Structure formats: C-alpha cells, structure tokens
PDB file of C-alpha atoms in Angstrom:
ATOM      1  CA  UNK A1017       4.828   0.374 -17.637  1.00 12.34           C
ATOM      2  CA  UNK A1018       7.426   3.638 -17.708  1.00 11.43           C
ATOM      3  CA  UNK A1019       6.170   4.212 -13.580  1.00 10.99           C
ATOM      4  CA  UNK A1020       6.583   1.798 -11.113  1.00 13.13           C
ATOM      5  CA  UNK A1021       4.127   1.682  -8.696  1.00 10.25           C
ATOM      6  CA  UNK A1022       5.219   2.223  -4.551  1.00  9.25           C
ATOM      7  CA  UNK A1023       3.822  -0.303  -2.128  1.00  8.53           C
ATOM      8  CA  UNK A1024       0.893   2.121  -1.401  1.00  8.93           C
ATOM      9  CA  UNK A1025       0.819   3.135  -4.907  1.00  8.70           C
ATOM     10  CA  UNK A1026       0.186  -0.254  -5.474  1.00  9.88           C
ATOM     11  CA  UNK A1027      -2.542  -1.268  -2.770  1.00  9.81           C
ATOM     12  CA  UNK A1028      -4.209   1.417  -5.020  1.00  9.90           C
ATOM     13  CA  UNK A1029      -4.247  -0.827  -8.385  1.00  8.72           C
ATOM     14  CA  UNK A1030      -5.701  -3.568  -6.599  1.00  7.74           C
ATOM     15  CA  UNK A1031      -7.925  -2.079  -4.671  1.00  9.08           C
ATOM     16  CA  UNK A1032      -9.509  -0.160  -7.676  1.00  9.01           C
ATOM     17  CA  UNK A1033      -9.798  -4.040  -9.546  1.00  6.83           C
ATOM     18  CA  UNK A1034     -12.223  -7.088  -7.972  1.00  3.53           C
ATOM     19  CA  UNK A1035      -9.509  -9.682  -8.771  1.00  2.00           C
ATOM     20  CA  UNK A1036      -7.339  -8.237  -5.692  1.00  2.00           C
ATOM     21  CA  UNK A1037     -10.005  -7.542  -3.269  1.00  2.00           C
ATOM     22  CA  UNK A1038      -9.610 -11.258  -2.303  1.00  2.00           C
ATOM     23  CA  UNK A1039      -5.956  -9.950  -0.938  1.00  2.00           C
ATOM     24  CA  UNK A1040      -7.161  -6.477  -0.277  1.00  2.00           C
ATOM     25  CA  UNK A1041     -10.056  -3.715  -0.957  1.00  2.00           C
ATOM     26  CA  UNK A1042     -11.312  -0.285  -0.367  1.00  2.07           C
ATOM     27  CA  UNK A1043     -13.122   0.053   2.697  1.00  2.00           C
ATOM     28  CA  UNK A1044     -14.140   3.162   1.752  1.00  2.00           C
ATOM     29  CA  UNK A1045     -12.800   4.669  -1.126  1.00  2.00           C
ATOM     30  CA  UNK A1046     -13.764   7.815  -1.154  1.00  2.00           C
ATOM     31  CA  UNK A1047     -12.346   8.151   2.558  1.00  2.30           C
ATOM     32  CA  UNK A1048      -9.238   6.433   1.218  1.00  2.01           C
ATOM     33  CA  UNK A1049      -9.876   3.682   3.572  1.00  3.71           C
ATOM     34  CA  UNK A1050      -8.606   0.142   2.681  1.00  2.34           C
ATOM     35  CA  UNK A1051      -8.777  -3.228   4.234  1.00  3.12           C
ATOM     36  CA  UNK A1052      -5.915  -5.610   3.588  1.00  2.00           C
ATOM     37  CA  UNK A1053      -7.953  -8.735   3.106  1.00  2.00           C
ATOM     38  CA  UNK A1054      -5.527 -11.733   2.355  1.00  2.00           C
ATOM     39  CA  UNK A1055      -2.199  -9.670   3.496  1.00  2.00           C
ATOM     40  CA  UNK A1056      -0.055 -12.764   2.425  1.00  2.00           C
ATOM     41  CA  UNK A1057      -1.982 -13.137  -0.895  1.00  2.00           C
ATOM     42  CA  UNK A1058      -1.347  -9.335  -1.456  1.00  2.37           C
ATOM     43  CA  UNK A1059       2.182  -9.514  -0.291  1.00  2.00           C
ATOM     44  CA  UNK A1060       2.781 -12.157  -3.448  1.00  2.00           C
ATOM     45  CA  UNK A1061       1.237  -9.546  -5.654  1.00  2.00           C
ATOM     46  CA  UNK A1062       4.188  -6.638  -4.154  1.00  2.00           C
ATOM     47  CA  UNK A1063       6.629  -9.591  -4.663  1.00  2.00           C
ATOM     48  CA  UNK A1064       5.168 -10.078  -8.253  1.00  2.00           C
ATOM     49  CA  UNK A1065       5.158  -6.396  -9.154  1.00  2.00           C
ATOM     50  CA  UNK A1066       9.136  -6.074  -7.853  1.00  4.70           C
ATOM     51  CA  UNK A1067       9.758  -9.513  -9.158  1.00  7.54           C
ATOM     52  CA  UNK A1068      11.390 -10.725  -5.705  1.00  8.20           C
ATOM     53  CA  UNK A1069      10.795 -13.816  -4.027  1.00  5.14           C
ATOM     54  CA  UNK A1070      11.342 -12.661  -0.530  1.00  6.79           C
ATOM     55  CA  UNK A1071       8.418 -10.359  -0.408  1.00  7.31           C
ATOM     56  CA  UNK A1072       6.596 -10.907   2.694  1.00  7.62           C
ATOM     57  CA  UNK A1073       3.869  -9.031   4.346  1.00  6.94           C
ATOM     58  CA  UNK A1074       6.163  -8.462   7.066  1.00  9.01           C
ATOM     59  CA  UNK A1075       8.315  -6.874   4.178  1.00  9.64           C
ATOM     60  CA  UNK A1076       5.187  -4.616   3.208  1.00  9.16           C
ATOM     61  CA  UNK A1077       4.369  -3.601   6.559  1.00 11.65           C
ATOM     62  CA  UNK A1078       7.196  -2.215   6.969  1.00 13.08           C
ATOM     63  CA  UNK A1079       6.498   0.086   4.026  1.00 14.88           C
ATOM     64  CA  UNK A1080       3.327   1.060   5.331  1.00 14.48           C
ATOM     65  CA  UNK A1081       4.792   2.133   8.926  1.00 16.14           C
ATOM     66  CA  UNK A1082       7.298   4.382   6.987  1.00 15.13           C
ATOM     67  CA  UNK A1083       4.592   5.709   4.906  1.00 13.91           C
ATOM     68  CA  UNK A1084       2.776   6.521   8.511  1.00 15.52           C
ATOM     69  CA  UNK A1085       5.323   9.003   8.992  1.00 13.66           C
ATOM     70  CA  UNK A1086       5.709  10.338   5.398  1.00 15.74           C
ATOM     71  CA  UNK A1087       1.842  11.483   5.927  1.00 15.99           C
ATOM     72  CA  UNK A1088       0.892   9.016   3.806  1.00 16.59           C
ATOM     73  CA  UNK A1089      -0.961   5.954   5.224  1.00 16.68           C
ATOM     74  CA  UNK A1090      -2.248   5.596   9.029  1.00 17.67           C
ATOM     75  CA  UNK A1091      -3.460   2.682  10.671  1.00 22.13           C
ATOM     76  CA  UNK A1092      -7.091   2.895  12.535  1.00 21.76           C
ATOM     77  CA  UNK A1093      -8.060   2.482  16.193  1.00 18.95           C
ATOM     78  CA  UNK A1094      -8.932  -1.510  16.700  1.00 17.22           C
ATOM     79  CA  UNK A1095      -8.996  -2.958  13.170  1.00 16.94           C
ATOM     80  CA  UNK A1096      -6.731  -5.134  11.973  1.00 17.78           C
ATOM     81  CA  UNK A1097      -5.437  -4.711   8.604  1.00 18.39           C
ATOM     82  CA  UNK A1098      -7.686  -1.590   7.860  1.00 19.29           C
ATOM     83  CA  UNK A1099      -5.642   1.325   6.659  1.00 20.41           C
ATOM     84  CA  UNK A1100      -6.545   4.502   5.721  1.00 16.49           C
ATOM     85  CA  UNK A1101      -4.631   6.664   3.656  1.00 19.52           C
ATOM     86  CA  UNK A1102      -3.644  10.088   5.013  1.00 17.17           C
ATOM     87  CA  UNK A1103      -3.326  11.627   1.391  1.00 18.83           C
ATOM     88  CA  UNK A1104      -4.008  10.963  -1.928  1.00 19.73           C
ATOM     89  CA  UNK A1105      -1.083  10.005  -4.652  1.00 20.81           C
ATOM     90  CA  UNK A1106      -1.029  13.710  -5.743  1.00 19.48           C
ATOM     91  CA  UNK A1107      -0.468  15.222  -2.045  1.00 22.12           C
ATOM     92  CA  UNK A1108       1.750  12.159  -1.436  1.00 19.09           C
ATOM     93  CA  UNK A1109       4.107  12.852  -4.348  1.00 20.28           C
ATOM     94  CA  UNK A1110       4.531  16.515  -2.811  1.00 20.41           C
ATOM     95  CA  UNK A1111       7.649  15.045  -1.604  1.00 23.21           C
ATOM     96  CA  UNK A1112       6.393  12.720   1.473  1.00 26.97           C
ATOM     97  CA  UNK A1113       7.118   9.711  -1.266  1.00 27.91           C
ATOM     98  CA  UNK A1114      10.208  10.779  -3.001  1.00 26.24           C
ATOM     99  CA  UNK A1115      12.392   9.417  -0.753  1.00 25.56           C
ATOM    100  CA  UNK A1116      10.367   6.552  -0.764  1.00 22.78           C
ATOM    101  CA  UNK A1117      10.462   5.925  -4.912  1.00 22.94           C
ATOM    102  CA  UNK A1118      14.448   5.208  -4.317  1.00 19.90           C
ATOM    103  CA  UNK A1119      14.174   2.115  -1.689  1.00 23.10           C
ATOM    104  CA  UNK A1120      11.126   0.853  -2.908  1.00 22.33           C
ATOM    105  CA  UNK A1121      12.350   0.001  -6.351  1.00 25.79           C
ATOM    106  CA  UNK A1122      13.945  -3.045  -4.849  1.00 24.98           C
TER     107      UNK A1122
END
C-alpha cells in the first residue's frame, strides 16, 4: 500500500481478520479493547510488515508504552497482554501519532 501502517495501526489489521487472532484479537472492539494473544507470533507479523528481522515483542512493547503517553493505547489493571486503546486512529492522528509515523517506519 501508499500508507504504512504504525505498530498500533497495525494490531488494528489483525485484529479486524481471524488469521491474526491466533497472535492477537479484539477483546472488545467496540471498547477498543485488544488482547495480544501469541505476542511473539504477532511480533513476526510487525517484523513482516517493516521487513526487519530483529522485530521482537520486546521491540513492540516498546511502541505501545510510547503510545501510552501519546493518548493512544493504555494497558488494563491485572491482565496481561490486554490493551485497550485510548483513541481511535482518527483522534490518534490529531497529532498524538505524528511523531510516531517518523520512528516507526523503521
């Protein structure tokens, strides 16, 4: 495609499609609430979208504590890998992101 997709912009795409919820799914999608089911299976798909091959989920983690603070994703009170997402892409791309669109190109 012409728009690359952000780590959280990505968790999106495979949360909307079955083949990813293996790796990670919607918890509650209409709360914007996700569950990272196979974090090191989803972590090869970030690494596959960016093309890198040291893509961790230690590498996407830290991605999703930055977005924490850029109002986009927060983490939940006892789960695991639950997140929920603060915003939606449209609020998010109000600037809490564009920062973001620069360092997670690589």
């Amino acid at each position: 495609g012409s728009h690359m997709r952000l780590l959280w912009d990505y968790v999106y795409q495979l949360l909307s499609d079955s083949r990813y919820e293996n790796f990670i799914r919607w918890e509650d999608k209409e709360s914007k609430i996700f569950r990272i089911v196979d974090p090191n299976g989803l972590a090869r798909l970030w690494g596959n979208h960016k093309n890198r091959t040291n893509m961790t989920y230690e590498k996407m983690s830290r991605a999703l504590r930055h977005y924490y603070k850029l109002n986009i994703i927060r983490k939940e009170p006892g789960q695991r890998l639950l997140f929920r997402f603060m915003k939606t892409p449209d609020e998010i791309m109000s600037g809490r992101t564009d920062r973001l669109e620069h360092l997670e190109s690589q």
